[PDB]
Amino acid sequence: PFFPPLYLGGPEITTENCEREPIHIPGSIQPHGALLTADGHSGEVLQMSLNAATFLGQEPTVLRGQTLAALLPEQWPALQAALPPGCPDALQYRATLDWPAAGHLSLTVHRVGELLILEFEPTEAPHALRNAMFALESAPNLRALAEVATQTVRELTGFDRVMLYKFAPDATGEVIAEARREGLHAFLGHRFPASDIPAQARALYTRHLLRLTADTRAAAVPLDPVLNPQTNAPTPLGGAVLRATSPMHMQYLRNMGVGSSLSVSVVVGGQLWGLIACHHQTPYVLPPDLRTTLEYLGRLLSLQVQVKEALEH
Amino acid sequence: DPLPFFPPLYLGGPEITTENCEREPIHIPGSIQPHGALLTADGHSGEVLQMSLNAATFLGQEPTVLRGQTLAALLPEQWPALQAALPPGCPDALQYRATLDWPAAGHLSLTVHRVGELLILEFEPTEPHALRNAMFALESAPNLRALAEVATQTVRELTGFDRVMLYKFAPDATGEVIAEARREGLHAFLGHRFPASDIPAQARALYTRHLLRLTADTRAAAVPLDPVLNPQTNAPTPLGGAVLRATSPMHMQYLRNMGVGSSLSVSVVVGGQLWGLIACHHQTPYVLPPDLRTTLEYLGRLLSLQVQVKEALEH
Ligand SMILES: *C/C=C1/C(=C/c2[nH]c(/C=C3[NH+]=C(/C=C4\NC(=O)C(C=C)=C4C)C(C)=C\3CCC(=O)O)c(CCC(=O)O)c2C)NC(=O)[C@H]1C
Ligand SMILES: *C/C=C1/C(=C/c2[nH]c(/C=C3[NH+]=C(/C=C4\NC(=O)C(C=C)=C4C)C(C)=C\3CCC(=O)O)c(CCC(=O)O)c2C)NC(=O)[C@H]1C
After folding, report:
1. Ligand 2 pocket test target in B254, B264, B288 with most atoms within 8 Å of CB
2. Looking at domain B1-125+219-247, does it have CATH number 2.60.40.1570?
3. How far apart are CA B57 and CA B62, in angstroms?
4. Is B18 close to ligand 2, i.e. is its CB under 6 Å away?
5. How would you label B11-21 residue by residue, b for 16+ Cβ within 10 Å and e otherwise?
6. CB-based contacts of B172, cutoff 8 Å, min separation 6
7. Which residues contact B260 (CB under 8 A, 6 or more apart)?
8. CA dist list (Å): A292 to A55, A152, B129, B293
9. Atom of ligand 1 nearest to the CA of A244
10. Is A65 within 8 Å of A45 (Cβ atoms)?
11. Residue A95: its chain B contacts at CB < 8 A?
């Protein structure tokens, strides 16, 4: 099963009980964005991140009464149609708001049962993706495909280190390709134990295909209330990219000297084949539109891995 | 019966009839569609060899001036990028794309690929979260039918085409329309089946390697290359990989007779085989700009993946 989260007086996590931390329900988010939850029917704002006032420019109480209808007039009917009752928690809808306080915000919404989860992040506003797609497809074998993928991602993102991280049948991991800035340790060829990514992290990564720690030293921002009014239970946040990272994994990233981290699942035959794993030495908020490019690349790599593995077997 | 290609018309080959379809050399027509321009150049020196006859009007230069310069001089910023992206021996399927600001012609999209020692350069005029939203909707579709319907509707919304269909090949190469989105008033093709020879075996082979093809105006005359043969080889210039390549006059007669002014299909490739086509129709001529066509190319790949996934959920 899972332990209760901390804020419901559950045990603190160790290397004895890695597998039992409820990472999906941390009750908090990373501070480079803001999150609101809301009722599926009424559009009634039920929870907000204590930092919402910053991003939205709204007097705190104003929000926690109001309706999405009021708050987002153009958007609220689109949401209603895009995310019908009963849809999967994996389905997401995005829009760009030109919002008074903040030039442009990206809005990302998904639905978990009766709750809409809304994420707001700063945003903005060429051929590198098309060029990359053809490059991946003409790679002659899996090894070269891995090399092209890591190089392409590094060029698109500027990340200090991009790895392709492949799982063995026992969930042992192996770095099979790597693109990195001069003057970093090489992780190429190295293998790491299964517990470095515990079973409950792997399952959640099979369904929700991208996560990131934008700053490995930033404090999480609580949800208020912490419990969903609807259920008097924790809000599931695993489909939210803003979700606070496990402190265990923040300790791991800090001990390696990483300041910003991101990864993309490569899913083949319904299973987690591996990860595009990215490191930056310093804090780094990759903007939403560039993340989208990596999300596309994730799908394309999933296709090409199967194609390429089929021409060996 | 499968038989080798006839020589093209310009090398004294025969004219093509319903009797001998499968032997038309559709990859070497010696000509392009008039809404863009094409140059060929030597892959090592960058000497310009062939050009479409309309090139002066896209590129704003006399032929003899174009042909008298190397790509190093014509494309000083792109020439080194081309050479890195398209190394000798690379496959003909690999494409490099850039946007140019050309004085006379505005923003041009440049698409380049390499066939042996030849570079092929295509120039076309070029111009929010719809793709991301579509990607997730496709993935959440519960079964093959719902996927097919979401895919057709999405493509129609992105493009404004009068008709978008998902055409699926059977094992005997007969095809069937299994989903479609269509303009009000058009008659339905859903569930209809069409003989295998409607898309002969040499088109289907090409359609497995080069995944998008089109006919922007089914009445437009093709524009010859000049000279027609590659001076490197005194042989035909391979245009399989060029979206500007002229369409088989057999196929254009088949489209005009249907009332279609514009056509475009995207290949859906599963396990190395052509599974089906995203086929689109417009009643009037219609040019879809290169950046919009890129969205369809990306959806072609997504759909190939999702078709595998939906079919595996099915035994
Ligand atoms: C008690 C359990 C421990 C534990 C937990 C844990 N680990 C993750 C997530 C990740 N671990 C990763 C491992 C590596 N990254 C690398 O760069 C290398 C090698 C150089 C390894 C072995 C990765 C890639 C992830 C994914 C997330 C990311 O990209 O940063 C989690 C889940 C984090 C979250 O989503 O909140 C957890 C709980 N780690 C341990 O070392 C043990 C002691
Ligand atoms: C003598 C041979 C004939 C022939 C040749 C032919 N056909 C193609 C390509 C295509 N044919 C297609 C057929 C259909 N389009 C539809 O909408 C339907 C059903 C409602 C069918 C059956 C399609 C979709 C294509 C693909 C290209 C496109 O999407 O427009 C070629 C190759 C064309 C080229 O690439 O230059 C050839 C030679 N068609 C016949 O009917 C016989 C008489």
Report:
1. B254
2. no
3. 9
4. yes
5. eeeeebeeeeb
6. B196
7. B218, B281, B282, B283
8. 21, 14, 9, 19
9. 36
10. yes
11. 128-129
**Domain limits, chain A:** 1-122+217-245, 123-216+246-313
Compute the 3-state secondary structure of chain A and give helix, strand, coil in percent, each to the nearest 5: 30, 30, 40
What CATH number matches the domain at A1-122+217-245, 1.10.340.30, 3.40.605.10, 1.10.1040.10, 3.30.450.20? 3.30.450.20
How far away, in angstroms, is A248 Cα from ligand 1 center? 8
In a 13 Å sphere around the CA of B97, the CA atoms on its Cβ side amount to 23
Considering only CA atoms, which of B45, B39, B57, B119 is closest in space to residue B82?
B119
Angle, nearest 10°, between helix axes A128-138 and A288-310?
10
Rounded CA-CA distance B155/A114 in Å is 31
The count of C-alpha atoms lying within 13 angstroms of the C-alpha of B2, restricted to the half-sphere facing its C-beta, is 6
Whether B139 and B303 have beta carbons less than 8 Å apart is answered as: no
For residue B195, what is the enclosing H or E element? none
B50 CB burial (10 A radius; 0-12, 13-18, 19+): buried
- Counting from 1 in the atom list of ligand 1, the atom nearest the Cα of A163 is 17
CA distance A141 to A309: 8
The answer to whether the CB of A90 falls within 8 A of the CB of B140 is yes
- Please give the structure tokens belonging to residue B222: 């093709």
Please give, rounded to a whole number of angstroms, the shortest distance from the CA of A206 to a CA of chain B: 13
Q: Find the A203 Cα to ligand 1 centroid distance in Å.
A: 13
- The dihedrals phi and psi of A305, each to the nearest 5 degrees, come to -60, -45
Q: Identify the H or E element spanning B17.
A: none
- Superfamily of segment(s) B126-218+248-315: GAF domain (3.30.450.40)
Resolution (A): 2.1
Tell me whether strands A161-167 and A115-122 are parallel, antiparallel or unpaired. unpaired
Handedness of CA A22, A27, A31, A37 (dihedral sign): positive
Tell whether ligand 1 has an atom less than 6 A from the beta carbon of residue A280: no
Contact (CB, 8 A) for B267 and B234 = no
Check residue B46 and give left, alpha or beta (phi > 0: left; psi -120 to 50: alpha). left
DSSP track, B104-136: TTEEEEEEEEEETTEEEEEEEE----HHHHHHH
User: Are B1-125+219-247 and B126-218+248-315 the same fold in CATH?
Assistant: yes
Chain B CB contacts of A302 under 8 Å are 305
Burial category of A14 from C-beta neighbours within 10 Å (exposed 0-12, middle 13-18, buried 19 and up): exposed
Atom of ligand 1 at shortest range from CA of A204: 35
The span from the CA of B27 to the CA of B248, in Å, is 9
- The CATH topology of domain A123-216+246-313 is Beta-Lactamase (3.30.450)
Phi first, then psi, for residue A280 (nearest 5°) are -130, 145
Interface touch A96/B294, C-beta < 8 Å? no
Tokens for B268, please give them: 């859906």
- The answer to whether the Cβ–Cβ distance between A303 and B298 falls below 8 Å is no
Could you give the residue ranges of the DSSP H alpha helices within chain B?
Answer: 55-59, 63-67, 71-74, 79-85, 130-140, 144-159, 201-209, 249-258, 290-312
HEC letters along A160-192: CEEEEEEECCCCCEEEEEEEECCCCCCCCCCEE
Phi, psi of B181 (to 5 degrees): -120, 135
